[PDB]
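Severity: low
Component: inverse-folding endpoint
Summary: output formatting inconsistent between runs
Steps to reproduce: submit the following structure tokens with default settings.
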């Protein structure tokens, strides 16, 4: 038993997950975009309806299970160490695998790209060799857009932790990000701000993992 609205949220989470699996199977076709001194690499891939999608890939010196807990399962707690986001509230839960959240991004690009708020549905799956949280924009009557923030809108994307088949003390983290921030800044500037936000995110994750092992 689920209302028609809860079934629509469940379908949206499953459709986002199908796109994420598709992007992950097209790894050989990712286009290198940028990397940094820590070896964090950002790629892009052109996806059928949502367009250009960014992908951060970073290896982490800890077991998959741990990242899964800090990033994929404690979304509300992430706000404390993940400085690229200033708020996260779960508005509603459907079954055990799908959640509807409200999220506010921190200002970015040295203040050139202002904060955005978002309403997302996301779909957590624990598999044999990986853990995923896939999502996409949705609507929720408790969080209509307001004058306080531009209401950004995520296309399909998510965060994935890939278990290492050869060394269980390490894992690989992948963030697939497709978002429309709206407004009128030129697209190249938004893109540079997204890449930069992904490296800051990796920098906070790495930091969080280190304090959690000391």
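Observed output (run 2 of 3):
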């Amino acid at each position: 038993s689920f209302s028609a609205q809860e079934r629509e949220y469940i379908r949206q989470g499953k459709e986002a997950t199908a796109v994420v699996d598709q992007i992950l199977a097209q790894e050989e076709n990712w286009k290198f975009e940028k990397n940094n001194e820590y070896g964090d690499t950002v790629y892009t891939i052109e996806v059928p309806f949502h367009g250009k999608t960014f992908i951060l890939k970073t290896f982490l010196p800890c077991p998959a299970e741990l990242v899964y807990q800090e990033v994929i399962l404690q979304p509300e707690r992430m706000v404390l160490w993940n400085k690229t986001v200033t708020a996260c509230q779960i508005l509603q839960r459907v079954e055990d695998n799908t959640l509807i959240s409200y999220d506010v991004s921190a200002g970015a690009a040295g203040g050139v790209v202002s904060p955005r708020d978002f309403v997302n549905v996301r779909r957590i799956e624990r598999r044999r060799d990986r853990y995923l949280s896939s999502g996409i924009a949705t609507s929720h009557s408790a969080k209509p857009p307001t004058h306080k923030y531009v209401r950004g809108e995520n296309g399909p994307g998510g965060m994935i932790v890939l278990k290492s088949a050869s060394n269980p003390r390490v894992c690989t983290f992948v963030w697939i990000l497709n978002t429309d921030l709206k407004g009128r800044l030129p697209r190249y500037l938004i893109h540079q701000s997204l890449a930069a936000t992904m490296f800051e995110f990796a920098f906070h994750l790495r930091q969080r993992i280190s304090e959690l092992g000391a």
